[PDB]
Amino acid sequence: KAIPKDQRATTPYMTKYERARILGTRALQISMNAPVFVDLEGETDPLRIAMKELAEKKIPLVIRRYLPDGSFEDWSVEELIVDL
Amino acid sequence: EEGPQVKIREASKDNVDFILSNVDLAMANSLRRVMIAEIPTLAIDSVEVETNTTVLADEFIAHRLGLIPLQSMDIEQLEYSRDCFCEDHCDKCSVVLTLQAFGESESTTNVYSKDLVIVSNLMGRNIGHPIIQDKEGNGVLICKLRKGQELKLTCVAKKGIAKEHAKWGPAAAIEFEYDPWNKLKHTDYWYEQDSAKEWPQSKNCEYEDPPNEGDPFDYKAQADTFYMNVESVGSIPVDQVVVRGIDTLQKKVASILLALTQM
């Protein structure tokens, strides 16, 4: 059904499952020769580069949050706060 | 003389009870261990079984042959296999012993270490000789056999030390003690009523002056005096098992200075 970027209702923060999966997912790509959006301070381990992209919040992904009834909310790694 | 001195007490061909005085504990032990594990010796390390009918299986005897102590006084002039340029061993790094037995006697024939035979050139030096201390003169019973049971071997002895295996070590045991009257309180005796009575006294109390109640606790007291007693197997005369000890240990402490140099 979708939901406006306003009227948004989820948690402003990133869930462990999310972050967990983002890094993974991102690694996977990086490990696949996808483009890396951060300067590698010399890093060479994908999941480690991923940890970097994720701290300069330079990961081009979007976490779609399905709700019990099907509608979803879309947040960007950008927005989502990362406490953990 | 200059520093750490000794006062040998009893002393035979197999033991060397003695007293090490004015040294650091570390040093006493350091030595002890050295004696136990790193003194180069000789012993069987390869058995080429040609024929055997005994009830002891091949590798069994094998193991035994290794344990059987061998002469090793000139050891210090028989290169370790790994260094001698010969493809897999030579008179210049190894000793060869043969073994043959047959059940001629209609009543159990014994195979003793004396039945070993040296077939490699000795080059004139005390080595590779099955050491005997048995009254009769046949030491260490290798194995028995019946009717027509045979046993043709061939061994090769090499250097090696108690690190690579004990069958090499010459030590076999070593007494060690100090502060017979707990003066540094290096312990806390466990009792039910009174330590003194329940916890036996050591023959080594005498050689050191008793307590003297009143006296406060001596704290600046360290550890002079140790009552060792290097025993021995025979591969080496109890003395060398103590000299070569102080020797090998010393060489090591050098190869650190030597390495500090090439660096």
């Binding site: 499952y17 | 504990l25 032990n29 002890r32 070593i174 312990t187």
Partner: protein, 196 residues
Amino acid sequence: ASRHGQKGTIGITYRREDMPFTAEGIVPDLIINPHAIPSRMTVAHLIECLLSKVAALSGNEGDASPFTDITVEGISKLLREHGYQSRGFEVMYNGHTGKKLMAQIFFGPTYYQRLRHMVDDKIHARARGPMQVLTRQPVEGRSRDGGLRFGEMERDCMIAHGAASFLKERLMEASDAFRVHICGICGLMTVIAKLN
């Protein structure tokens, strides 16, 4: 294992250099942890040591038979008649330094059985290999090169952990996994795919 349900396995081997010794010279062959006593409450095992450490010196095959007229007190006397502390303990020096061990250790013989089931008869690894025929899943047993189990319970934990992908992975890419075709009409495997 001893003879008191004291089953336990090796953790490491040491040599006389590193081994804790008793002035006499002697050193142990075994070194079981003190903790394995208080709750097992097997004192018999504890006693056998004393009885044996005695009949080891006297050479009089100690008797530890069931209910009899023997005592612990009755033995501590015999061991004392020999010079070593009446309870078994002895002074010992820490092999690395050679310093004394503040406390004493209950030292002395004990019979120990070497039960079968050794390690190199179980160590087992597999990364793909023989595959069953009916199922097409890894075969069973270390004997046939088989694979290990990831059953219900181990799943239930991954679900717990919330480890979605890893679950799918154990379940597919590392076991079954198969590519079939369907009809968008009648949801069956009917389809006759000539991938060519």
